Structure formats: structure tokens, C-alpha cells
Short mmCIF file of C-alpha atoms in Angstrom, two decimals:
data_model
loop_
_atom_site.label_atom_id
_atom_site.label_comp_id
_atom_site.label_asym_id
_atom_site.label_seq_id
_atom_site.Cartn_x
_atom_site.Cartn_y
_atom_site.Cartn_z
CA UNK A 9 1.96 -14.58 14.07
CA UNK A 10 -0.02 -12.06 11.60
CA UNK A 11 -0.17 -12.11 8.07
CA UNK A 12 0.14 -9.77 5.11
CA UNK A 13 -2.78 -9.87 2.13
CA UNK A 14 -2.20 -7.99 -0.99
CA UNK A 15 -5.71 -7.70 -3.09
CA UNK A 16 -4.96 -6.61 -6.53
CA UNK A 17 -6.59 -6.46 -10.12
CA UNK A 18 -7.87 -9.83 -11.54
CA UNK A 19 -5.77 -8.96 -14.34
CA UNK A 20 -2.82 -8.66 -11.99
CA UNK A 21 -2.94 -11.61 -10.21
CA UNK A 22 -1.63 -13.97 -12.02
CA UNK A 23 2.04 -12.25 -12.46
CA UNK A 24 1.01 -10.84 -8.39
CA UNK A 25 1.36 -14.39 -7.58
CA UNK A 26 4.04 -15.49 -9.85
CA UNK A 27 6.21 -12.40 -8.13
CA UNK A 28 4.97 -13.02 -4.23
CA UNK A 29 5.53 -16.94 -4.95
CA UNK A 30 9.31 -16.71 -6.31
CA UNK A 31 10.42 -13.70 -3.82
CA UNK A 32 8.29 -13.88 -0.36
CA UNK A 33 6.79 -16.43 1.49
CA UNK A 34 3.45 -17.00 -0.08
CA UNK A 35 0.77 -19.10 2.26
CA UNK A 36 -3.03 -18.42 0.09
CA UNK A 37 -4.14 -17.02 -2.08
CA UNK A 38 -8.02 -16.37 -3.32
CA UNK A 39 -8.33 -15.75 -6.62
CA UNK A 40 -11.61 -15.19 -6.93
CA UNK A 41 -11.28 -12.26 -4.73
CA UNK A 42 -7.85 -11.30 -5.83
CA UNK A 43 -6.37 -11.85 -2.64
CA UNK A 44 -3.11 -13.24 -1.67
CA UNK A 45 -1.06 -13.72 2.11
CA UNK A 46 2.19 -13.63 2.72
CA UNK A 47 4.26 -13.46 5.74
CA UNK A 48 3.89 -10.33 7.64
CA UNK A 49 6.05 -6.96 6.45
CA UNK A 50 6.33 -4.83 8.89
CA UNK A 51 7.28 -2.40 6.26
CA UNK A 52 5.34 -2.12 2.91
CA UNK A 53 8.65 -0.37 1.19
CA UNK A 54 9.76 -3.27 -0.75
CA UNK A 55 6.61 -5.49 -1.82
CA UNK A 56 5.22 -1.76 -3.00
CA UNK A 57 7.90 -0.96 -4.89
CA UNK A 58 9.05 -4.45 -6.18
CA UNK A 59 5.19 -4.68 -7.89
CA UNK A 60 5.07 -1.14 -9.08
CA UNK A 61 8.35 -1.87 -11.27
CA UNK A 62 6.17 -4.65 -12.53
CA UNK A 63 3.06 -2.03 -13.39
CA UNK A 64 0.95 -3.74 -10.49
CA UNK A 65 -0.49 -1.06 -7.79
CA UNK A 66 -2.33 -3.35 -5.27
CA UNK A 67 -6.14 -2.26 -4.43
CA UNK A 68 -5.50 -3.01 -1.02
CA UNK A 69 -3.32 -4.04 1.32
CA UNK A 70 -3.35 -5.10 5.10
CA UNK A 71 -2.32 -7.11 8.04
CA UNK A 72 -4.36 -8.99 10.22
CA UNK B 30 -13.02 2.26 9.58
CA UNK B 31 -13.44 5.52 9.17
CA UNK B 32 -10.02 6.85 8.03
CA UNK B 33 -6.54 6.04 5.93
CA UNK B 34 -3.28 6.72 7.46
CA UNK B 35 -0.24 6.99 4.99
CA UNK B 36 3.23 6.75 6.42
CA UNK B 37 6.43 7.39 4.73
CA UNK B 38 10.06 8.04 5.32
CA UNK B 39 11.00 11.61 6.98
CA UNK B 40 12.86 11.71 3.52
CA UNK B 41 9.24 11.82 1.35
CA UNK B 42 6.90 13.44 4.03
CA UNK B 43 7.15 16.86 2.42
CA UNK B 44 6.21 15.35 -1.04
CA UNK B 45 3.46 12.84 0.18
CA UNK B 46 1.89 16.00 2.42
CA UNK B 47 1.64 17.93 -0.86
CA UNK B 48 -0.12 15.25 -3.31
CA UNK B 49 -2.30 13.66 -0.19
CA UNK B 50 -3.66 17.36 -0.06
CA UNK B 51 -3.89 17.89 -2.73
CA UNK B 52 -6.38 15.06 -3.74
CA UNK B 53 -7.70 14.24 -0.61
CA UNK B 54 -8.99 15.48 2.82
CA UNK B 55 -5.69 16.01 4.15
CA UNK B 56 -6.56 15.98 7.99
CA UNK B 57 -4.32 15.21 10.90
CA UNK B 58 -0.21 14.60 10.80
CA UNK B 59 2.52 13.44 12.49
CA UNK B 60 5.67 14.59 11.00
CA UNK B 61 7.69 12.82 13.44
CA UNK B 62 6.42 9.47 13.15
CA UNK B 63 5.66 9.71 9.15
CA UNK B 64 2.03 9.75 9.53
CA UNK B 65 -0.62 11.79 7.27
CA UNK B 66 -4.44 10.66 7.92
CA UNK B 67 -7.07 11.18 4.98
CA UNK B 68 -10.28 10.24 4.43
CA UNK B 69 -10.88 6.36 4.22
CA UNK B 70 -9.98 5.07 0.88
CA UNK B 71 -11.27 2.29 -0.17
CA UNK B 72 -8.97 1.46 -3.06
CA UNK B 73 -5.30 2.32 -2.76
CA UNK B 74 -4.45 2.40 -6.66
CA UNK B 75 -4.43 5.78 -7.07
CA UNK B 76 -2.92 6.72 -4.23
CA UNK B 77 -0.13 4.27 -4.38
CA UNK B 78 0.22 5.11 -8.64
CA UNK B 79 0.87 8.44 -7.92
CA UNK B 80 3.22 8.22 -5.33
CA UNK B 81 5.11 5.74 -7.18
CA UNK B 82 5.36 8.59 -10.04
CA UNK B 83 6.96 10.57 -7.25
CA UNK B 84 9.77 7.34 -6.61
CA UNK B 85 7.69 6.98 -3.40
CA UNK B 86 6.73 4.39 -1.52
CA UNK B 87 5.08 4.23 2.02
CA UNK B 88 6.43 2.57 5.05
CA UNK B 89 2.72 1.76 5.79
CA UNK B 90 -0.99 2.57 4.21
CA UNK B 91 -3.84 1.72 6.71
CA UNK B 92 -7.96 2.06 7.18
CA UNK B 93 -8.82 2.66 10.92
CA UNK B 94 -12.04 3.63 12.95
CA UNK B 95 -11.35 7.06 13.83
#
């Protein structure tokens, strides 16, 4: 039942979180931190590449 | 946590080997399973950038104790 987070740029997270809301399952999100968490990937392909065509390179990126 | 693993399709290994060397403290692999293990990064941005450049993108990117 793990999750995804995806930390990014302050200055990404506003368009991070517009993307994650409208095309995965986003649960919370900290802004203050610049965190947001999804449901789990199992493979980072997609959410990597899908926010790299939108110039956003997360800092980090993890499941718990 | 003491390093990052980078995994990546068969298809980009080659690639991925030659820029995570390149940068970093390329240290153990597993070319079967996808895996190349540098030393811990903190912040993926570069790493992830660059790769993109290369049409790249991994399966996986993780810190472990190691």
C-alpha cells in the first residue's frame, strides 16, 4: 500500500501539481517542502518523462 | 544511505554507464538487471537533466545504505 513522493523546485510546484493532479492519482502534497504523493509507480519511466517535456526535473523522488 | 542506484532499460544501459561515469563515482553494475550504483546524490536534477538530453529516462533512481 506504498506511496510515491516527487519533491521538486518551489518554482515547479505549482504546474508539478497541476500535472500529477489532472494525470495520476494525487493524495498530498506539502508545499512548503515541495513535496507531493501519488500512488505508487513501480516504474519512474512515465512521471519522469511526462515532467521533463514540461521543463520540471524533480529533486527527488522515492517510495515509501 | 550511503549510495544511488540508477536503473534503466537494457536499451539505455550503455549510454547511462557512460554519462554516470563520467560525472560520478561510477562503482558497482548490474547489466542484467539495469542497475549502475554511484555515490549518494542528494539531488537528482542533474542527473535526471542530463539523461533526459540523452531521451533517457530511468526505470528507477534510488538512495540506499550500502
Amino acid at each position: 500500500s506504498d506511496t510515491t513522493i516527487v519533491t521538486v523546485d518551489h518554482k515547479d510546484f505549482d504546474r508539478t501539481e497541476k500535472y500529477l493532479a489532472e494525470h495520476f492519482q494525487l493524495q498530498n502534497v506539502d508545499k512548503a517542502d515541495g513535496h507531493l504523493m501519488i500512488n505508487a509507480q513501480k516504474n519512474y519511466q512515465v512521471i519522469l518523462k511526462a515532467l521533463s517535456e514540461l521543463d520540471i526535473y524533480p529533486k527527488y523522488i522515492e517510495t515509501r
